[PDB]
Design a protein around this nucleic acid. Structure first.
Lengths: 91, 98
DNA sequence: AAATTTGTTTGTTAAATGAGCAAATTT
DNA sequence: AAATTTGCTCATTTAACAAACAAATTT
């Protein structure tokens, strides 16, 4: 049914799968909670910043540094991929 | 004085440790493990859409959550995400949030 | 009766793309 | 020594943008 998922344990020590989208809902339920109406500004860039980096690490780890297969896996262009590598100084 | 909160620490999730103790790990680690899990279970099948897959799994709840916050208001939501109100309206359509 | 937000459009800017190449690098 | 990937470039398609503004809505 749904492919991006993370392991959760309940009080009965049962491990169990739960979408990543549910974790993001939580990270942000929390983000806002701990603000007290202080303006947010760049939340799109913030969330994305934190999602691109682990995606890039993990697909470069998988494709043994091969930038070319990485781009093909992710479905982005070799250029794009490089640019993003510079952005996070991952090169 | 104020204490440093690194960017990893700004979006965080509730994890339990080897001592049955609740603690806040970065969201980025949850993304890392989602993908680890994902590769393990792939078994040499070709992939061609992993960016668009991760993006969809992430934008959908970023949107869902921000529009709850602005009690449905598209203008503030776009100001507070940092994107043009047109993109926002477009992304919202993309997932039928209207 | 405001003030704001929506829904839609326009022209402009910025980003992403594909193709091409020599020169490194892996095979 | 052949095959592939890198590190550029250029040019082209596509997305994101800010600025409008009448019509609907919320204050």
């Amino acid at each position: 049914s749904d492919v991006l998922t993370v392991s959760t344990v309940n009080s009965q020590d049962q491990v169990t799968q739960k979408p990543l989208r549910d974790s993001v809902k939580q990270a942000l339920k929390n983000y806002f909670a701990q603000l007290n109406g202080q303006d947010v500004n760049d939340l799109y860039e913030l969330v994305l910043a934190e999602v691109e980096q682990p995606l890039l690490d993990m697909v470069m780890q998988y494709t043994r540094g091969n930038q070319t297969r990485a781009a093909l896996m992710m479905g982005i262009n070799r250029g794009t991929l490089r640019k993003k590598l510079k952005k996070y100084g991952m090169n």
